[PDB]
Each structure stands twice: as C-alpha cells, then as structure tokens.
C-alpha cells in the first residue's frame, strides 16, 4: 500500500521519497520526537507529566493575514472573497501563484523521511472529509493524529484521500513581494485540488483550523450545518449545542455530569444528527492549574503534546509563563476526558441551540427566546462584550462562505427538529456584575428541561426579545433586565447605544441580499 502511496505523493511533486513512517502508533511518535539528533523546532522534551512539549518559534497563533484560497472555477462565484463591502481573509490567488507554492512545498518535502498521517473530519458517516497530511516533522503527524478522528484498521484499508495538507513549515517564499503576498509566509488552500499548503509558520492551529475553513466550504453547500460551538448529549438522546465567544462561560456551561460531551469546537449537523469533526482537543494551558481545571489537566499525560509552554531544567513544566506567548496549548485525543460520547462522537438532532453572550452594556436580558429570523441576525452578529467584540457565526476567522449561509443551514436543521434558539446574557446587568453562576446555570437547566417554554413571556423593547417571567430556581428580578436598574433611564440610554453598535456591525452583511432582508429582525 507504500507504493500506492508513493505514486500520489509524486503525483503532487514530491521526489526523491525516502523513508515513510505510515500512521504510526502513539508510542512510535513518542520515540521519534524525542530521538536524539532532532535539531530546531523538530524536537520534543520530556516532562515530568510523561507528555511531550514542543515549540513553534516565531508563529504562536494563527495567521489571518498568511491565509488564501486559490481563484479558479470552483471558487470564483463561491467563496466569500474578501472585499470593500466586507473585509475578511478570504484573499484570491492566482493558479500560477499556487503552482509556484505547491512546488516550492513539494521540493521541501522532498528527498527526505516523510510521515504520513490519515484521518477524518467529521464523525459523519457521509459527510466526513478524508484528511492526509504530509510532513517531515514527526510531532505535526502526532498533532493531526489527535486532532482528526483516528479510522480503524478497516477503514485504513479502504482510506480516500479527499484533502491533502503538505506541511512545510521549514520551507518560506522570497518571491511574495512580486506575487503580491503578505509576508514570506502562507496558509494557501485549492478547492479544485483539495490540497492544504503550510509554509513558514509552525503553529498547530493552522492544520486544526485548515481543515474547519474546508469543511465550512463543502457542508453548507450540501444543506448540512457546519458550526464553531460544543455539543453535548442527555441521558434521553436530547441534543444541545452552545455557541460563544472567550469570557462567555461555553465551557462551563457546556460541562455536565449528566450529559455527555459530543465535542467542545466544530461539529457539523446532516440529516442524521449533530457530529463531532475532530478526535481531539486544542486547549490553552496559560495559567493552568490542577484545581482549576482538573479535565484539562488530567488529559495531559502520554499522547497529549504541550506546545510553547516553559519546561524547566528537571522537566517540570510551568504552565504560568507566557514568556514564549500567551497562547500556550495543548492537544490530546478526545478519549483523555471522561465523560464524553464513544465510540464516535456524534448524536442525535439538536433541540435547544444556545448563544452565550458576555453584555458589558448591561442591557441584554439573562435569557431571550428567539424567533427564527433573530436566531439568523443574531448568528450572524456574534456579539459579546463597554467594548463589543462582533465575530460572525462566532467564527468570523473560518467563514469560506458568506455568514448567511451558515446561517441559513442552521435554521433549516432547526426547523426540521422542531428547535429552539435562546440568547443567554451570562455577563452583566444594572447590578453592575455579572450574573450568578447560580442564575446561569438555572437559565441552562431551564433550556435544556424544557421548562423556559411553560414560561409565560413578556417581550423587552427595542430588540423586541421574548423574555420569561420566571424560571425554576432563577431569581425572577433579574429575567426583565430593566428590573435590575434603579433608574430605568441608565437602560434605555445603553440599550439604545448598544443596539446602534448592532445596526452599524451589520451594514457589511447586507451586501448579501439575502442577509439584507434579516435588518428587520434586528434591533430598532
Ligand atoms: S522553501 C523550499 C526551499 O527551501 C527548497 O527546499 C530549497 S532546495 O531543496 O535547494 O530547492
Ligand atoms: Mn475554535
């Protein structure tokens, strides 16, 4: 099957292939990233947790500005090009660019030892996408490993190679300046080939996060939902879905012993129900701690692989320095946690789909029911925050298509299952604090048990939200936002600020006609 292999690989120009260790096991990647000899960034140290931590150098995020998707015609009158109207990282390249890159990758990767890593994008039988990646770093083949879902020896045999990432992170482009790039760097992607180019940037997000931008291409154009949230599952089957940006509260929310976790980022939602796209976990480990986050911290152990973080002289690892970045991670196959959906990550069809936002205006109630026009304008605005922050569909960085599309599946699923959508205000109100984690997670019981929908509702002016007047265990001055107000007029002067602050965001949706429709379920 090495030969087989060979021949695709010369096929995408490599040459001169030496060795290839294929789909190694965990304890084979453990010995060859910490083999001695290994120089630079290739190198693995071991820790006193028995995980492997390695570095990135000068990339510790990802980088937007290194991204394109190539223009031909596939792509042309499909993806959501960047534009006046809407900047995004979309950004076109030229077939003859690209074929310069995929060149000057393949020349990278070639004459040496390769390892080649198989596995799939989505826990859906049907919509799961056939991921290779090709590298001569061992610790990226053991990134992908973790973060796609790993086939069975069955499926290797009858594995289809439906996306190819070349990894050169070693290899940069003195030629950007003339071919019109952004720096010596690129994340390049052809549709039309299904390939994946790294060069120059060794971040592990940009493999992880690749692979999510491919996958919000193909699925929605096939009416199958493709979304940035976490998923989880009750004892009755009963699906949620949480969306939300950093300082939301999604991962606490999302946690419950009484429910299984079916993932925590990206999952997809086709006619069978919600799926998982990745066999793993990317978590930022600055500040870290045991007690804090004893999941987390639990999963790190053989297999998981620390990046950026400090190791000291005898190993042990101090996961408060940020001296290398603030953005320290870890990955691990999803297994290292407990309580969570196996043998594949995915589930029935969701029934409640909840967007978490942090309100520093202090204006948004603790929980709004939506209707399906708003659950659209609210997707697309992606609000949290007084400074407001506005990523659409919560994963602005991700969005090959335009956000209505998105926008467009989600309600669709919705609709076929009967769904809901809430909007929970997990920050602040008149009080001027946030919420109680008490109150909160009231809030979610009260979505996840059905019981918001006795709730008798009143509707709150302005962004004309169904609110309720009361629900089990939540304090009932706190479901009218206004109530927490002593002078009702410090409400209505944010509330107007703060919808004015939507009603400018969403001027650059609207060059899409049909997300122009939805300014009428905006705030007024
Ligand atoms: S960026 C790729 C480039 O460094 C290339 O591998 C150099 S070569 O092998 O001398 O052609
Ligand atoms: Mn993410």
């Known amino acids: 099957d090495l030969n087989k292999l060979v021949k695709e690989l010369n096929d995408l120009?490599?040459?001169?292939?030496?060795?290839?260790?294929?789909?190694?096991?965990?304890?084979?990647?453990?010995?060859?990233?910490?083999?001695?000899?290994?120089?630079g960034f290739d190198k693995g140290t071991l820790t006193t947790l028995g995980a492997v931590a390695v570095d990135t150098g000068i990339f510790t995020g990802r980088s937007p500005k290194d991204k394109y998707i190539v223009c031909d015609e596939t792509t042309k009158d499909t993806v959501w090009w960047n534009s006046e109207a809407?900047?995004?990282?979309?950004?076109?390249?030229?077939?003859?660019?690209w074929k310069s890159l995929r060149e000057l990758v393949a020349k990278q990767l070639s004459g040496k030892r390769l390892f080649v890593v198989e596995g799939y994008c989505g826990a859906s039988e049907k919509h799961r996408i056939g991921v290779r990646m090709v590298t001569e770093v061992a610790w990226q083949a053991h990134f992908v490993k973790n973060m796609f879902i790993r086939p069975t020896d069955e499926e290797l045999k009858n594995f289809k190679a439906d996306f190819t990432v070349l990894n050169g992170a070693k290899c940069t482009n003195p030629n950007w300046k003339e071919q019109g790039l952004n720096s010596e760097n690129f994340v390049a992607f052809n549709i039309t080939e299904g390939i994946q180019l790294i060069g120059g940037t060794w971040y592990g997000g940009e493999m992880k996060k690749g692979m999510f931008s491919m996958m919000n291409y193909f699925l929605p154009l096939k009416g199958v939902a493709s979304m940035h949230c976490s998923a989880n599952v009750g004892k009755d089957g009963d699906v949620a879905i949480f969306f939300g940006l950093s300082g939301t509260g999604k991962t606490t929310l999302s946690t419950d012993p009484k429910r299984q976790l079916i993932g925590d980022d990206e999952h997809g939602w086709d006619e069978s129900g919600v799926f998982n796209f990745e066999g793993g976990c990317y978590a930022?480990?600055?500040?870290?701690?045991?007690?804090?986050?004893?999941?987390?911290?639990?999963?790190?152990?053989?297999?998981?692989?620390?990046?950026?973080?400090?190791?000291?002289?005898?190993?042990?690892?101090?996961?408060?320095?940020?001296?290398?970045?603030?953005?320290?991670?870890?990955?691990?196959?999803?297994?290292?946690?407990?309580?969570?959906?196996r043998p594949v990550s995915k589930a029935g069809h969701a029934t409640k789909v909840i967007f978490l936002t942090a309100d520093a205006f202090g204006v948004l109630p603790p929980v709004?029911?939506?209707?399906?026009?708003?659950?659209?304008?609210?997707?697309?605005?992606?609000?949290?925050?007084?400074?407001?922050?506005?990523?659409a569909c919560?994963?602005?960085?991700?969005?090959?298509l335009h956000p209505i599309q998105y926008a467009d599946v989600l309600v669709?699923?919705?609709?076929?299952?009967?769904?809901?959508?809430?909007?929970?205000?997990?920050?602040?109100?008149?009080?001027?604090?946030?919420?109680?984690?008490?109150?909160?997670?009231?809030?979610i019981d009260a979505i996840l048990d059905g019981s918001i929908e006795k709730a008798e509702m009143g509707e709150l002016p302005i962004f004309n939200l169904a609110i309720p007047k009361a629900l089990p265990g939540v304090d009932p001055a706190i479901l009218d936002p206004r109530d927490t107000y002593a002078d009702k007029a410090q409400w209505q002067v944010k509330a107007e600020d703060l919808a004015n602050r939507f009603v400018k965001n969403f001027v650059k949706y609207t060059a899409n006609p049909e997300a122009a429709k939805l300014v009428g379920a905006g705030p007024k």
Do not use: C
């Open 13 to 39: 120009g490599l040459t001169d292939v030496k060795e290839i260790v294929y789909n190694p096991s965990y304890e084979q990647l453990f010995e060859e990233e910490t083999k001695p000899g290994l120089e």
């Open 86 to 97: 809407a900047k995004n990282d979309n950004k076109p390249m030229t077939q003859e660019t």
């Open 284 to 341: 930022k480990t600055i500040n870290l701690s045991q007690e804090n986050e004893p999941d987390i911290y639990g999963a790190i152990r053989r297999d998981a692989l620390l990046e950026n973080v400090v190791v000291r002289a005898d190993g042990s690892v101090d996961f408060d320095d940020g001296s290398k970045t603030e953005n320290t991670r870890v990955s691990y196959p999803i297994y290292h946690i407990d309580n969570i959906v």
């Open 368 to 391: 709004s029911k939506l209707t399906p026009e708003q659950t659209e304008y609210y997707f697309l605005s992606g609000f949290t925050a007084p400074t407001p922050t506005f990523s």
């Open 394 to 400: 919560f994963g602005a960085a991700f969005l090959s």
């Open 412 to 443: 669709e699923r919705m609709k076929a299952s009967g769904a809901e959508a809430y909007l929970v205000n997990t920050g602040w109100n008149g009080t001027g604090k946030r919420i109680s984690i008490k109150d909160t997670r009231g809030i």
